Design a protein around this ligand. Sequence first.
Ligand SMILES: [Zn+2]
Ligand SMILES: [Zn+2]
Ligand SMILES: [Zn+2]
Lengths: 48, 76, 195, 65, 139, 81, 58, 49
Amino acid sequence: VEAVYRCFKCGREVKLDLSITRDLRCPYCGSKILYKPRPKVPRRVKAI
Amino acid sequence: ITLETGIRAEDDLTHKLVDIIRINNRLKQNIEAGAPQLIIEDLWDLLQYHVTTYINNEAPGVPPAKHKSGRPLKTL
Amino acid sequence: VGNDPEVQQIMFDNLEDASDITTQQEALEFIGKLVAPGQAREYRLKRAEYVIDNNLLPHMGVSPEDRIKKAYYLGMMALKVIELSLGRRPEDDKDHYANKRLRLAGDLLKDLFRVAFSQLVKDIQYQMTKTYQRKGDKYTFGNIHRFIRNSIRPDVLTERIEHALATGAWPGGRTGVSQLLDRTNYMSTLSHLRR
Amino acid sequence: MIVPVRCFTCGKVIGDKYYEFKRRVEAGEDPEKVLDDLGLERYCCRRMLLSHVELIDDIMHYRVY
Amino acid sequence: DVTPDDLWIVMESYWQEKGLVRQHLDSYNAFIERGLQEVVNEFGGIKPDIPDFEVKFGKIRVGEPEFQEPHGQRKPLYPMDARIRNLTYAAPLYLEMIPVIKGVEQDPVEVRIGELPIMLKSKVCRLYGLSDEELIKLG
Amino acid sequence: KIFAVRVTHGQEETTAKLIYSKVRTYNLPIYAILAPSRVKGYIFVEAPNKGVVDEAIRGIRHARGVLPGEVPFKEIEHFLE
Amino acid sequence: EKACRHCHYITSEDRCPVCGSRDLSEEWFDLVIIVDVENSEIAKKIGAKVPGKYAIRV
Amino acid sequence: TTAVPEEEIREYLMSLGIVPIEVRRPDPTLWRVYLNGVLIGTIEDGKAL
Ligand SMILES: [Zn+2]
Ligand SMILES: [Zn+2]
Ligand SMILES: [Zn+2]
């Protein structure tokens, strides 16, 4: 299950498969902290 | 209690019973083996101490038994 | 004890009541009887001299040469007691700040490091004794560097320090020294850092 | 974290007048004269501009994606 | 003659120069500087039950806040990194072993005795001496 | 004068070696050490008296205490034969 | 670490310190040691004459 | 506060004219001098010190 992620420090595209990944890291910088990016589907919010 | 780490957290009474059974088995083996009198007396005193702590861990004049973490056990 | 005539009179009374003892050795044997009942004479003597060395005002030292200054300190204490008895000085008033001292982070951390390092040195000594006993002698003496290096167990120190800081349970019976930092807002955090 | 759009009490829109007030009061002009020039008569509005603190500018430095 | 406002002008400089948490920082700095050596000197050295052998303690020092990666090597660690990863913001401790054989010392060996947690913004912390635009970039 | 010392359940054999190494450091007057496998957590010390036992048992690991009293030799032969 | 079949003396090396033969049964379930033969009466009971370690029922 | 070395303070106090306690007894004519709670000597005048 391939998915995209955003690095914590540099905020760049990292594509990785956690289920099989053993060494979770951004390739550009050794950071082990990554975000899961927001989906592109529209979302509805009440303006209360 | 099955701890969140996946390790069984035994109740204090169960642990104290295990100690009592172990001491009793050692005493029986030593008696069957003809152990010296002093060893048998010491084991008898140890069994008495374990029993009196199991019945009451706050009994006056004894050092209360302690858990692995160092906390005092809770007994009957 | 002092030079005051009433002080020396009270001390004359005490000395008359204490004429039973004769020399220092008799006092040592008396304390040995006090501390080690039913034991051999030499054992009680030695283990009572040990108590005199390192349980009677250790801050003066633990050397057998430290007798005289310890005696002077005890005499001054007795003089203070008898002066209070005569009404020449008032009570201590321990609520006064001069008698209060704060235990900062460094002092407590020093105590924790002391106990952890004591455990560590015990473990190291045990490990080297085991290694010499079981490997042999020519092994240890051939490569002292390896024999020392592969016998240290840093996890023993790290685990105890980390657990003591995390739980807040401190050696010597102290509890609640380390608390979870309050992060509700600016004032709460800063106030928690000064308590 | 940013200037509110309307005064909490009466509802008059004062969201656009904050930067003008800050600039003129920094330049040296009397704050009460600046407020009166902007047309904020009731002190309910004047409170909102006088007591506001700009805090959007120091949280923008941390990003979450 | 001075007025209470003039005294206030002097008063605020004390907080400006010292801060509000001096009690922790100064105590921890003094501990790091001297208390470790004092405690090491108190024990003197190891006395193993081995014939004609003894170990004497030397100097002690603190390294830098690091972390030993399991599938990797030691790398620098930062407080925001430690907070998220549930790690311990600590630095290794290095101590000198002086072997004494036949009552004679020889060349010492330095070993790692453990990790000591580091007080934030102390003189041994990585955040010490950094500017606002650097702290912001560090999170 | 034989004495009996109590140790932890599974390290009597290692404690015997520890005592045998410890006796050299201060040249203790200990004559022999017997740790039979028929008693769990108990070792037998040959010493002139209790004080030397106490001194030789201070820092050795897995050792908790020495039982008071002097166990008769007449109750030991069928262990060492 | 082994022990001789006859001497019952536990050996930490290949050669027994008292017997020339390297025969080593290793079945020393029991363990007895002696510091000084001249004074220890257990050694007199068992007839040993050399300080060190020994076994009983190998 | 944080502690300074004790020995330097003791030596400085000694150099100011304190006689050691081992020399003479605490005559009520003489002031007592305590350094961090331990008696270290005696002086003739306390206010001058
Ligand atoms: Zn990255
Ligand atoms: Zn308004
Ligand atoms: Zn042989």
